[PDB]
Amino acid sequence: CPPGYFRMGRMRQCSRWLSCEELRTEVRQLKRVGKRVFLSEWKEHKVALSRLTRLEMKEDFLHGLQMLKSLQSEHVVTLVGYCEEDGTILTEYHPLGSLSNLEETLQQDVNTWQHRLQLAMEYVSIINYLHHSPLGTRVMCDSNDLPKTLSQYLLTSNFSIVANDLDALPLVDVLIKCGHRELHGDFVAPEQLWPYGEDTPFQDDLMPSYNEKVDIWKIPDVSSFLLGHVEGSDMVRFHLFDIHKACKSQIPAERPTAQNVLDAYQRVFHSL
């Protein structure tokens, strides 16, 4: 579709986004899931209706919407309509839900290492697109553990992955910092950890900023999750150890680009 247009289901042609007047009159709310998200319907289409919960985040809502508008692609959920006055956004609904439900969802004829590895190639394709997005290099900042990282992606009925939550996408080039609290653990990139030791208490203004290599650090965790434990999973992990080792490089500049990881994933896929 051209910019400003959507299409879903058996629609043969692209329709212009819905405006305040259509969301106000043509959308029947169904049941509450999940921004307060509602499963809804617009004529024959199940759609997601997110309403701004607290007016104090009117800018975290708008800049997520602007991010959603510019980044419409095969990697991002389909924007159907929005209304700035109501603080409301309409998107295409996906019954299979988050990437978190993957294991529950996969119990099928697509429960193979081939499909899970291609699922992993799809995840890296989103990261690669985000790093070369129309709005510049964007970082998926709200990925501090595995459940939260997967919660931001949806599984479509064709078993593809799309990014859904775009409310924490800062711009690199200009460095970035994911929040203003101290981050801990190993799921985050080590450059996201406080670098100055216990004798200097953490202080956000002294925390050095970083770039999009923090996304690369987290690829193996998501890819290993998608591979799961089916016949061939450990075979794929064997062939992915060294590329995942490069992703876990302590020095960010030594980590490969998302494009590199995808190329390696594709050579490993075809080889097996």
Domains of the chain in sequence order? 1-272 (1.10.510.10)
Beta strands 153-155 and 5-6 are unpaired
Cβ of 10: how many Cβ atoms within 10 Å?
7
- Give me 149's structure tokens: 């990282």
Q: Where are the beta strands (DSSP E) in 22-107?
A: 27-32, 36-42, 45-51, 79-83, 88-92
Residues forming beta bridges with residue 42, ordered by sequence position: 27, 45
Resolution (angstroms) stands at 2.5
Asked if residues 88 and 52 have their Cβ atoms less than 8 Å apart, the reply is yes
Distance CA 137, CA 124 (A): 14
Count of residues in the chain? 272
Provide the 10 A C-beta neighbour count for residue 258.
24
Q: Fill in the DSSP letter of residue 132.
A: T
Dihedral angle over CA of 95, 98, 103, 105, nearest 10: 0
Sequence-distant (≥ 6) Cβ neighbours of residue 12 within 8 angstroms? none
State the method.
X-ray
Please state, in angstroms and as integers, the Cα–Cα distance from residue 178 to each residue in 1, 5, 14, 28, following that order. 32, 31, 36, 36
In degrees, rounded to 5, the angle at the alpha carbon of residue 176 between the alpha carbons of residues 188 and 252 is: 50
- Whole-Å CA distances, 241 to 119, 162, 223, 225, 247: 18, 26, 11, 14, 10
